[PDB]
Amino acid sequence: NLPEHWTDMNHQLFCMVQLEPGQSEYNTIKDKFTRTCSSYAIEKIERIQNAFLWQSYQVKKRQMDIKNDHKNNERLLFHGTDADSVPYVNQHGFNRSCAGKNAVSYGKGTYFAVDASYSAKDTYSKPDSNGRKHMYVVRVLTGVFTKGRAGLVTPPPKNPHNPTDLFDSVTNNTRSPKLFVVFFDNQAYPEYLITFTA
Amino acid sequence: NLPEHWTDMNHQLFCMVQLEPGQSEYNTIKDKFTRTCSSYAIEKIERIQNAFLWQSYQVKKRQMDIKNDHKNNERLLFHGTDADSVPYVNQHGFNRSCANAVSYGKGTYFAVDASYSAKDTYSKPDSNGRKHMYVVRVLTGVFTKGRAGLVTPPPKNPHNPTDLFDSVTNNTRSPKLFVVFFDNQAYPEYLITFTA
Ligand SMILES: NC(=O)c1ccc(Oc2ccc3c(=O)[nH][nH]c(=O)c3c2)cc1
Numbered sequence: 534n535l536p537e538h539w540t541d542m543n544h545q546l547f548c549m550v551q552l553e554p555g556q557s558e559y560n561t562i563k564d565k566f567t568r569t570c571s572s573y574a575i576e577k578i579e580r581i582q583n584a585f586l587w588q589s590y591q592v593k594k595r596q597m598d599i600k601n602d603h604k605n606n607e608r609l610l611f612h613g614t615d616a617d618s619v620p621y622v623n624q625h626g627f628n629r630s631c632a633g634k635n636a637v638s639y640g641k642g643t644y645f646a647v648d649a650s651y652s653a654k655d656t657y658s659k660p661d662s663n664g665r666k667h668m669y670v671v672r673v674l675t676g677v678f679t680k681g682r683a684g685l686v687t688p689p690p691k692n693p694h695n696p697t698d699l700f701d702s703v704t705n706n707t708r709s710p711k712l713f714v715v716f717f718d719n720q721a722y723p724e725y726l727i728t729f730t731a
Numbered sequence: 732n733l734p735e736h737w738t739d740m741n742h743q744l745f746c747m748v749q750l751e752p753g754q755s756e757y758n759t760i761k762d763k764f765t766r767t768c769s770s771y772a773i774e775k776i777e778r779i780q781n782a783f784l785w786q787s788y789q790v791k792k793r794q795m796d797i798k799n800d801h802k803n804n805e806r807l808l809f810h811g812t813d814a815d816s817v818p819y820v821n822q823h824g825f826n827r828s829c830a831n832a833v834s835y836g837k838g839t840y841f842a843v844d845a846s847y848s849a850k851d852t853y854s855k856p857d858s859n860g861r862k863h864m865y866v867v868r869v870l871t872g873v874f875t876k877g878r879a880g881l882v883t884p885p886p887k888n889p890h891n892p893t894d895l896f897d898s899v900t901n902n903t904r905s906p907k908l909f910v911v912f913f914d915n916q917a918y919p920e921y922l923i924t925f926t927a
């Protein structure tokens with residue numbers, strides 16, 4: 534069940550693994566980040582190994598891959614948060630019940646950015662007492678999506694005469710998506726934590 | 732993976748199966764209800780066969796059995812709701828974001844006694860007087876007393892804030908309700924359609 538690239542946790546359920554600059558795994562994340570935030574500098578990048586979050590996520594992915602039958606359900610997105618949130622996200626993932634109101638709300642859920650530049654804003658990745666900012670890189674089950682609306686507590690139906698058959702997520706703009714909102718637990722796996730500074 | 736007492740679904744992932752009155756399964760579920768609701772009239776009982784909800788719930792059960800190092804994590808509880816919520820729950824289960832009082836926290840509420848779920852405030856009568864109550868497998872695990880404004884259960888010791896209780900209750904020594912704060916901690920197993 535657990536990915537073969539992960540470090541041996543030997544009977545442990547959770548581990549943060551520090552990556553090494555020069556490895557393809559560190560460099561692909563650093564490049565995805567610097568593509569839009571070349572003003573900030575990366576302190577470190579940690580791989581999140583959370584067995585339970587991974588299992589529940591992989592079950593949801595397989596279900597959405599079966600339901601949508603077209604396999605393009607997963608995007609790699611960013612999520613800036615405050616230091617006080619990091620230990621909870623590392624252990625328990627993204628909880629919509631803890632989510633702030635977004636300055637442009639497309640629903641009451643957890644928000645993920647396409648561009649690191651938006652997650653790098655102090656309003657999301659709030660600098661801690663030492664000036665460290667925190668951003669997750671996140672596997673998100675975006676699935677089939679539509680433009681959201683501020684009132685949503687779940688994704689809207691695809692068809693108003695079948696109210697229980699839902700979009701998987703919502704976005705700000707279906708043509709040029711810049712954010713995604715997810716409304717269910719285990720729809721997002723926090724894969725890497727980037728610690729960065731001015 | 733799919734329980735042996737489920738009936739064939741012709742390669743479908745979702746089915747509501749009406750139970751045969753007077754057989755073992757129906758009698759077991761009826762007696763759980765009539766223990767405290769002997770004055771109500773059962774119109775029908777349906778087995779909820781939702782493969783995806785079941786899979787997600789069984790994963791959380793296996794996770795809680797490991798974390799707690801024992802298999803006493805699951806209880807059978809009741810949840811009354813309005814008819815307009817029934818299709819959603821059948822398909823998607825219980826959702827804290829849908830949300831009656833939330834005195835013990837902002838989660839989904841389950842009753843120990845069917846009589847509490849049978850009150851009209853929960854199992855709201857429809858046009859024709861039909862009321863709806865789910866029988867629910869709930870991962871109550873290790874629980875504590877709730878309070879207003881909880882968004883997750885409390886920590887089992889604030890020296891490790893991320894190691895949480897599984898659920899909260901009104902009274903730890905004699906509970907009558909349980910609150911859970913995560914998707915897939917509750918499987919809706921049977922839908923009882925009844926009248927006063
Ligand atoms: N929690 C977060 O980190 C976060 C941050 C930003 C965010 O909304 C965005 C709003 C607008 C834009 C945009 O106009 N262009 N590109 C973007 O990526 C973007 C994201 C959602 C979530």
Ligand SMILES: NC(=O)c1ccc(Oc2ccc3c(=O)[nH][nH]c(=O)c3c2)cc1
Nearest residue numbers: 810811840842843844847848853907908
């Ligand atoms: N949506 C629901 O069905 C629902 C209904 C009621 C409910 O709280 C209860 C409150 C008090 C009591 C009690 O004093 N004795 N026995 C009970 O079972 C009980 C349950 C939770 C959930």
